């Protein structure tokens, strides 16, 4: 006791020039009715040393004395305010955030228990609000005797239960939920760093608990730095003998290693001097993979990132794009995926459909305990701000496929489910290796048309076709360090290119050649050049630096290369002037006509038809409904 | 126990009323035999299955009994207010006087007053909208007007179930509700009770009380429908005659 | 006799005597209620030969009258409330005693501490009297709920009583006592139950989101349900915007009861629960901004500049840009006297090959849009629909969970992959769009609800890029009154020109390396102030145009309807709003003409 008076003087006497902060901050939080206060514990060790260590030693005791020392002034301020000029005051909640000593999540001693600990991770599933009656008034039914139970700190023990005694017995005691004050158990579960460094193992994760002003502040997937209390709950053996599952009481939380040795920067800058740097780089990636050079470099410009522009309005251009490895096996793509997965600083290889238990996308899973919700996580939620590796991309569930196509453009996924509307960000960049269908004929077939009925997927996809442990560090280095920017001369060069492109290409499309040119394609080229200038690390682009990109993308175009009046003349004239009921005229009769006109391909047939239902020939709607599986 | 499930006195007094019932009943005037007597024998001749009650002749019975006192207790205001009891109790009042509920054989219906009788001056019938219907009218006798939808195929519904101990003899009368029931077994026979061996009972269909209900849902006349919203619907109970 | 009167209760009631005697205003008000009932009672009896019992109470009085009763009810509604309602029922009995119920109170206020919104709520606010505002969904479908029990006992005659205290009964909770259904009295005499003696009350419970408007930048919404019964039941539709006075209940055991996480289902009771009006931002224009508007309003060329302000990123489509603007504005709204309302707002539609940014733009729309929801293809369920949330949630009152359009009423609905969406929906859309309202009979709550939201939609060319040369129809691919219904239909083309392309790529590159903030500001004030009304100045021009339109166009193209005309109307009125003109002008007409032409050609 009366150390509280030291906390009252700490709230008051402690002053940084020119202004004592906590007095003001409190005065507002009450004015805001925040019933909350934020402490930097380091600042306390600054003002009062002994109290600080006193705290870090055994906070379980002290924290409440803080809270009282606060509410004691809070009453004074409260009255001085309410009276000039215009109870019931609860014990405030203080959020203490220290940036000082991180702990590796993989590394926690049993000596940290019931002591203040700061460490960080990625929140997988932010669990799920509950009601904590921390003050609860009780009544004996027969005895009519009344009581109140107040539980200050708890795991999820469950900590406390009702008494058994008021004949009157068994437990007569009856909860009056009138007089009880309930708090929110978030029960977030903190997962460690996924990219590093179990690397052989499923990474370990921790259970957290968040009350009152600490609830709901974070969407899971948000990297955060927790100040919390290492603690343990017995729970129920899933264990033994005597093992107690630890857990972290979290107070408070500071939401969001980039630091490296000088020598790393040095050797970096040395490599930066390399003229063959891009070339030798292109040599580093695919030691085993023979060739696939366009692909080889493509990975490179991919990892380098690209232009990210938040420039007003909130419209934020993104980087960097997408990669399509699709093709027949023997291309090594599946392995290469593993490879980049290695090289990429933060990478998640998920081929699916998602796998196995992991939702391919950020998913909402109720913490079954505490109920309410927690982010179930997904590939993207975890891979955000990094690489995302997808295979069998054609095999993916439609449900997530949408969210893909959406987030891919927006980098943001929005989850409206139930009481949670949050929109979450995936800065992840996706590279996809599809398996094309039926083989070389798909190239003989229109280069597109392979994806669902919708090449739209392809429209979204931009590119369609050293120890490397250091290169990781370098990749990080260049990535964080420099934001390149573009040269006007190159810019106009590009204008000429694309004009020749859409121009010559439309001139090619005058014949309705089945195949494209997107402004998106242009921007892709852009982000490519930015990627290479960031490979050069230069804040500024070079026109030649672009000239490369132009040709490379021209190869991707080559990959892209490999009659509506006629087909609709056929189909429409058929329907219209042949069998209006359509009866007798179905898949047989078209099979005859087109068979006898030698223009039928089943894909072409169903393509013109799906076009007709899809152009809403509602007669084609109608015929589909009937004549189709009516058959003829 | 007292102080649990309290009693509360109300202006309602059934004792005198039931008497009043017996008085108006078949001892009636306006309609040589009094209407209820003769009608009652026509039923007693076995010819007439259901009995339609009318409150207007009750209104007349009261103006007879008002004037021409002594002042007699008001049944109408009590009937429409409860009327549920009034059914069964009225039934008993009748069952005595003829030219238990198990052997009745007759159905009792009532006809509300609008009317010129309202104009007497004397509510029970105000034809109403389902909108106009408030959940506070529950238990009230009400008259309404609306569009018949649904209007169902009568099916026999059983009231009470008769099993016979055949050891203890007697009978087992199980009333039944809602959709389903579980048939009783052993014997509840007071003689089969406390015996070392209870009789076994099996139902007899000839004995039990069954009824053909007939179902309907009714919709707002839709002219009555408020400007907005949509016309409401309502279920209705009908059985026997 | 119960637990016998407590001078706690006694003094609480007694203390609440002088009030309401002072202020006596209520003293006669109740009498008014009684009077009304009496008169209606005479109408039923004599002619063929009703009102609720709650009376509002302004909390302003207490502070002056009783600061401690003020503070007490606010804090301890549990204690203060019931004795007060008692006092009320008593005085009520006093007013007219002779002829032969809760007699509740609204508790007006004068709020509050205790003024908080559904986002910021509990744990201290737990079990205090609260006022929260927000939208109405998921609503509820009322169920009648029963009260007090009555039983006849033969041969003993007599009668019984029983009562039932809901978890929702009172507000602040209580040690619950299950009473089940009284029967078979002890001594073993059976109890014949009686209705019409046994009282009942209708029941309803609805959910309340935090005010969409006031919602934060972006996040998950946090809503709370409240129970409403009898009188309180049914007053408002899902999608209504309202502020509710009711206590915060913790009700229910939170799992400590059954020994074998989440806890303590909590809810708001009633109570006052006022429906409130809101437009169809926030914002703060101070002095300076409003001035800035004012000066700028004079600028003759301002409109084009505006039309430009939208597309930092987008070349061209200034026609379109202008269009969007007009969408934001929207030709006021007209509800004729005792007759249907003229739709003010306009529905827009765009058609072209992808990369048209059509997707992209829509975002930009959503941005400064001031609400509203965006929808993409399918999409659904129900879109704007309440789904008639089954079952109940809570109490037996089956919820109506207000959907997009209802929620988007007053607001901008973005329809993406509009072609993709199911005709099943489209049928409804016909109603929503034109009829301007939604109607729900489903099971169920039979009501028609109003979603006034404006509409834009983007949908792919029927198949491939073929839109360009394709016939004006069948390029369409979504007949028909659909086509009619969108006030605006825009065909964009991706066809290439090298000169044009250069022009693009310049802008493009530059991008990689009239302030919109002021925009929405300029918008809101314009919105609330002021309506241009209309002027015969233009009327001629318009008719001239329209006749020219049906006339020459039906040869040229189609469809031209009265719809076309109305669209013109809304168009002009908006343009005046852009002009800020309190009147319509013939110039604005020339504009709407130009645009409509562009639409046609």
mmCIF file of C-alpha atoms in Angstrom, chain A residues 410-602:
data_model
loop_
_atom_site.group_PDB
_atom_site.id
_atom_site.type_symbol
_atom_site.label_atom_id
_atom_site.label_comp_id
_atom_site.label_asym_id
_atom_site.label_seq_id
_atom_site.Cartn_x
_atom_site.Cartn_y
_atom_site.Cartn_z
ATOM 1 C CA UNK A 410 -7.780 -4.847 -54.284
ATOM 2 C CA UNK A 411 -5.131 -6.526 -52.097
ATOM 3 C CA UNK A 412 -7.946 -6.390 -49.560
ATOM 4 C CA UNK A 413 -10.406 -9.071 -48.680
ATOM 5 C CA UNK A 414 -13.607 -8.088 -46.959
ATOM 6 C CA UNK A 415 -15.376 -10.485 -44.645
ATOM 7 C CA UNK A 416 -18.890 -9.456 -43.709
ATOM 8 C CA UNK A 417 -19.865 -12.673 -41.939
ATOM 9 C CA UNK A 418 -22.097 -12.349 -38.886
ATOM 10 C CA UNK A 419 -21.209 -9.580 -36.455
ATOM 11 C CA UNK A 420 -17.873 -9.014 -38.166
ATOM 12 C CA UNK A 421 -17.742 -6.917 -41.329
ATOM 13 C CA UNK A 422 -13.984 -6.350 -41.239
ATOM 14 C CA UNK A 423 -12.104 -5.922 -44.509
ATOM 15 C CA UNK A 424 -8.642 -7.405 -44.305
ATOM 16 C CA UNK A 425 -5.581 -6.708 -46.412
ATOM 17 C CA UNK A 426 -3.507 -9.188 -48.337
ATOM 18 C CA UNK A 427 -0.443 -7.520 -49.718
ATOM 19 C CA UNK A 428 0.572 -10.974 -50.890
ATOM 20 C CA UNK A 429 1.442 -11.328 -54.568
ATOM 21 C CA UNK A 430 0.225 -14.484 -56.229
ATOM 22 C CA UNK A 431 2.083 -16.698 -58.645
ATOM 23 C CA UNK A 432 0.032 -19.491 -60.099
ATOM 24 C CA UNK A 433 0.922 -22.688 -61.904
ATOM 25 C CA UNK A 434 -2.106 -24.066 -63.681
ATOM 26 C CA UNK A 435 -2.472 -27.392 -65.350
ATOM 27 C CA UNK A 436 -3.879 -26.737 -68.833
ATOM 28 C CA UNK A 437 -6.472 -29.141 -70.186
ATOM 29 C CA UNK A 438 -6.267 -31.678 -73.048
ATOM 30 C CA UNK A 439 -2.673 -30.764 -73.983
ATOM 31 C CA UNK A 440 -1.155 -29.080 -77.034
ATOM 32 C CA UNK A 441 -4.597 -28.828 -78.640
ATOM 33 C CA UNK A 442 -5.448 -26.119 -76.099
ATOM 34 C CA UNK A 443 -2.750 -24.126 -77.864
ATOM 35 C CA UNK A 444 -4.317 -25.240 -81.133
ATOM 36 C CA UNK A 445 -7.519 -24.230 -79.407
ATOM 37 C CA UNK A 446 -7.835 -20.558 -78.726
ATOM 38 C CA UNK A 447 -4.910 -19.662 -76.428
ATOM 39 C CA UNK A 448 -7.523 -18.603 -73.900
ATOM 40 C CA UNK A 449 -10.829 -20.329 -73.182
ATOM 41 C CA UNK A 450 -8.880 -22.755 -70.974
ATOM 42 C CA UNK A 451 -9.895 -21.191 -67.639
ATOM 43 C CA UNK A 452 -13.355 -22.319 -66.471
ATOM 44 C CA UNK A 453 -15.577 -20.754 -69.065
ATOM 45 C CA UNK A 454 -13.762 -17.590 -68.040
ATOM 46 C CA UNK A 455 -10.380 -16.506 -69.217
ATOM 47 C CA UNK A 456 -11.063 -13.637 -66.815
ATOM 48 C CA UNK A 457 -8.677 -15.366 -64.475
ATOM 49 C CA UNK A 458 -6.054 -14.920 -67.156
ATOM 50 C CA UNK A 459 -7.062 -11.290 -67.557
ATOM 51 C CA UNK A 460 -6.215 -10.833 -63.902
ATOM 52 C CA UNK A 461 -2.907 -12.686 -64.196
ATOM 53 C CA UNK A 462 -0.213 -10.346 -65.456
ATOM 54 C CA UNK A 463 2.464 -12.712 -66.728
ATOM 55 C CA UNK A 464 1.281 -15.740 -68.681
ATOM 56 C CA UNK A 465 3.701 -18.316 -70.009
ATOM 57 C CA UNK A 466 24.736 -16.433 -54.893
ATOM 58 C CA UNK A 467 23.965 -18.552 -51.842
ATOM 59 C CA UNK A 468 20.287 -17.436 -51.997
ATOM 60 C CA UNK A 469 20.386 -17.416 -48.230
ATOM 61 C CA UNK A 470 22.107 -14.116 -48.680
ATOM 62 C CA UNK A 471 19.810 -13.418 -51.608
ATOM 63 C CA UNK A 472 17.017 -13.640 -49.106
ATOM 64 C CA UNK A 473 18.737 -10.959 -47.055
ATOM 65 C CA UNK A 474 19.421 -8.876 -50.137
ATOM 66 C CA UNK A 475 15.859 -9.290 -51.352
ATOM 67 C CA UNK A 476 14.662 -8.003 -48.024
ATOM 68 C CA UNK A 477 17.271 -5.267 -48.204
ATOM 69 C CA UNK A 478 16.351 -3.838 -51.596
ATOM 70 C CA UNK A 479 12.709 -4.477 -50.808
ATOM 71 C CA UNK A 480 12.555 -2.300 -47.712
ATOM 72 C CA UNK A 481 15.232 0.191 -48.664
ATOM 73 C CA UNK A 482 14.415 1.842 -51.955
ATOM 74 C CA UNK A 483 11.313 2.930 -53.818
ATOM 75 C CA UNK A 484 12.292 3.448 -57.471
ATOM 76 C CA UNK A 485 10.610 5.953 -59.735
ATOM 77 C CA UNK A 486 10.199 6.329 -63.470
ATOM 78 C CA UNK A 487 12.008 8.424 -66.191
ATOM 79 C CA UNK A 488 9.856 10.402 -68.607
ATOM 80 C CA UNK A 489 11.768 9.358 -71.708
ATOM 81 C CA UNK A 490 11.165 5.746 -70.892
ATOM 82 C CA UNK A 491 7.554 6.767 -70.247
ATOM 83 C CA UNK A 492 7.027 8.055 -73.769
ATOM 84 C CA UNK A 493 8.905 5.056 -75.140
ATOM 85 C CA UNK A 494 6.233 2.982 -73.454
ATOM 86 C CA UNK A 495 3.464 5.121 -74.947
ATOM 87 C CA UNK A 496 4.815 4.330 -78.409
ATOM 88 C CA UNK A 497 5.070 0.648 -77.575
ATOM 89 C CA UNK A 498 1.472 0.254 -76.391
ATOM 90 C CA UNK A 499 0.127 2.335 -79.244
ATOM 91 C CA UNK A 500 1.884 0.004 -81.642
ATOM 92 C CA UNK A 501 0.481 -2.779 -79.480
ATOM 93 C CA UNK A 502 -3.235 -2.143 -79.195
ATOM 94 C CA UNK A 503 -2.979 -0.647 -82.689
ATOM 95 C CA UNK A 504 -1.243 -3.461 -84.549
ATOM 96 C CA UNK A 505 -3.128 -5.949 -82.359
ATOM 97 C CA UNK A 506 -6.532 -4.531 -83.210
ATOM 98 C CA UNK A 507 -5.492 -4.517 -86.875
ATOM 99 C CA UNK A 508 -4.872 -8.184 -86.203
ATOM 100 C CA UNK A 509 -8.293 -8.442 -84.527
ATOM 101 C CA UNK A 510 -10.104 -7.020 -87.572
ATOM 102 C CA UNK A 511 -10.655 -10.618 -88.693
ATOM 103 C CA UNK A 512 -12.137 -11.683 -85.311
ATOM 104 C CA UNK A 513 -9.083 -13.837 -84.599
ATOM 105 C CA UNK A 514 -9.830 -15.877 -81.506
ATOM 106 C CA UNK A 515 -7.478 -15.008 -78.652
ATOM 107 C CA UNK A 516 -5.678 -9.404 -74.512
ATOM 108 C CA UNK A 517 -4.349 -5.832 -74.709
ATOM 109 C CA UNK A 518 -5.108 -4.225 -71.390
ATOM 110 C CA UNK A 519 -4.141 -1.033 -69.793
ATOM 111 C CA UNK A 520 -3.620 -3.558 -67.029
ATOM 112 C CA UNK A 521 -1.052 -5.160 -69.298
ATOM 113 C CA UNK A 522 0.650 -1.800 -69.593
ATOM 114 C CA UNK A 523 0.697 -1.280 -65.844
ATOM 115 C CA UNK A 524 2.094 -4.769 -65.529
ATOM 116 C CA UNK A 525 4.969 -3.727 -67.740
ATOM 117 C CA UNK A 526 5.272 -0.743 -65.421
ATOM 118 C CA UNK A 527 5.562 -2.740 -62.207
ATOM 119 C CA UNK A 528 8.076 -4.917 -64.033
ATOM 120 C CA UNK A 529 10.318 -1.972 -64.777
ATOM 121 C CA UNK A 530 9.970 -0.813 -61.183
ATOM 122 C CA UNK A 531 10.948 -4.310 -60.092
ATOM 123 C CA UNK A 532 14.131 -4.133 -62.134
ATOM 124 C CA UNK A 533 14.989 -0.587 -61.077
ATOM 125 C CA UNK A 534 14.667 -1.906 -57.532
ATOM 126 C CA UNK A 535 16.905 -4.748 -58.625
ATOM 127 C CA UNK A 536 19.227 -1.993 -59.710
ATOM 128 C CA UNK A 537 17.850 -0.523 -56.442
ATOM 129 C CA UNK A 538 17.987 2.811 -58.215
ATOM 130 C CA UNK A 539 15.377 5.338 -57.065
ATOM 131 C CA UNK A 540 15.144 6.121 -60.779
ATOM 132 C CA UNK A 541 14.455 4.001 -63.857
ATOM 133 C CA UNK A 542 16.471 3.857 -67.074
ATOM 134 C CA UNK A 543 14.950 3.694 -70.529
ATOM 135 C CA UNK A 544 17.092 0.690 -71.446
ATOM 136 C CA UNK A 545 16.155 -0.867 -68.144
ATOM 137 C CA UNK A 546 12.675 -0.589 -69.600
ATOM 138 C CA UNK A 547 13.687 -1.741 -73.060
ATOM 139 C CA UNK A 548 14.401 -5.102 -71.518
ATOM 140 C CA UNK A 549 10.978 -5.245 -69.899
ATOM 141 C CA UNK A 550 9.308 -4.382 -73.193
ATOM 142 C CA UNK A 551 10.777 -7.409 -74.902
ATOM 143 C CA UNK A 552 10.264 -9.756 -71.977
ATOM 144 C CA UNK A 553 6.589 -8.898 -71.809
ATOM 145 C CA UNK A 554 6.619 -9.329 -75.578
ATOM 146 C CA UNK A 555 7.593 -12.926 -74.958
ATOM 147 C CA UNK A 556 4.750 -13.257 -72.482
ATOM 148 C CA UNK A 557 2.653 -11.914 -75.318
ATOM 149 C CA UNK A 558 3.989 -14.652 -77.524
ATOM 150 C CA UNK A 559 2.744 -16.939 -74.791
ATOM 151 C CA UNK A 560 -0.575 -15.152 -75.044
ATOM 152 C CA UNK A 561 -0.874 -15.744 -78.774
ATOM 153 C CA UNK A 562 -0.538 -19.526 -78.668
ATOM 154 C CA UNK A 563 -16.410 -14.759 -85.685
ATOM 155 C CA UNK A 564 -19.391 -13.715 -83.639
ATOM 156 C CA UNK A 565 -21.249 -12.760 -86.793
ATOM 157 C CA UNK A 566 -20.607 -16.236 -88.167
ATOM 158 C CA UNK A 567 -21.239 -18.273 -85.043
ATOM 159 C CA UNK A 568 -24.245 -16.162 -84.107
ATOM 160 C CA UNK A 569 -25.376 -16.210 -87.713
ATOM 161 C CA UNK A 570 -25.318 -19.980 -87.455
ATOM 162 C CA UNK A 571 -26.894 -20.278 -84.015
ATOM 163 C CA UNK A 572 -29.346 -17.403 -84.277
ATOM 164 C CA UNK A 573 -30.468 -18.181 -87.825
ATOM 165 C CA UNK A 574 -30.877 -21.791 -86.704
ATOM 166 C CA UNK A 575 -33.104 -21.036 -83.745
ATOM 167 C CA UNK A 576 -34.980 -18.244 -85.470
ATOM 168 C CA UNK A 577 -35.752 -19.711 -88.888
ATOM 169 C CA UNK A 578 -35.590 -23.449 -88.064
ATOM 170 C CA UNK A 579 -37.452 -24.688 -84.991
ATOM 171 C CA UNK A 580 -39.037 -21.965 -82.827
ATOM 172 C CA UNK A 581 -40.331 -24.449 -80.280
ATOM 173 C CA UNK A 582 -36.797 -25.751 -80.553
ATOM 174 C CA UNK A 583 -38.215 -29.211 -80.054
ATOM 175 C CA UNK A 584 -36.673 -31.790 -82.386
ATOM 176 C CA UNK A 585 -33.861 -29.292 -83.044
ATOM 177 C CA UNK A 586 -31.536 -29.931 -80.032
ATOM 178 C CA UNK A 587 -28.025 -31.280 -79.513
ATOM 179 C CA UNK A 588 -28.689 -33.853 -82.133
ATOM 180 C CA UNK A 589 -29.853 -31.432 -84.809
ATOM 181 C CA UNK A 590 -27.040 -28.971 -84.268
ATOM 182 C CA UNK A 591 -24.778 -31.983 -84.174
ATOM 183 C CA UNK A 592 -26.117 -32.791 -87.633
ATOM 184 C CA UNK A 593 -25.987 -29.338 -89.163
ATOM 185 C CA UNK A 594 -22.620 -28.445 -87.698
ATOM 186 C CA UNK A 595 -21.463 -32.003 -88.188
ATOM 187 C CA UNK A 596 -22.643 -31.690 -91.776
ATOM 188 C CA UNK A 597 -21.170 -28.172 -91.994
ATOM 189 C CA UNK A 598 -17.837 -29.465 -90.619
ATOM 190 C CA UNK A 599 -17.545 -26.477 -88.251
ATOM 191 C CA UNK A 600 -18.545 -28.191 -85.008
ATOM 192 C CA UNK A 601 -16.205 -28.538 -82.139
ATOM 193 C CA UNK A 602 -17.937 -29.559 -78.943
#
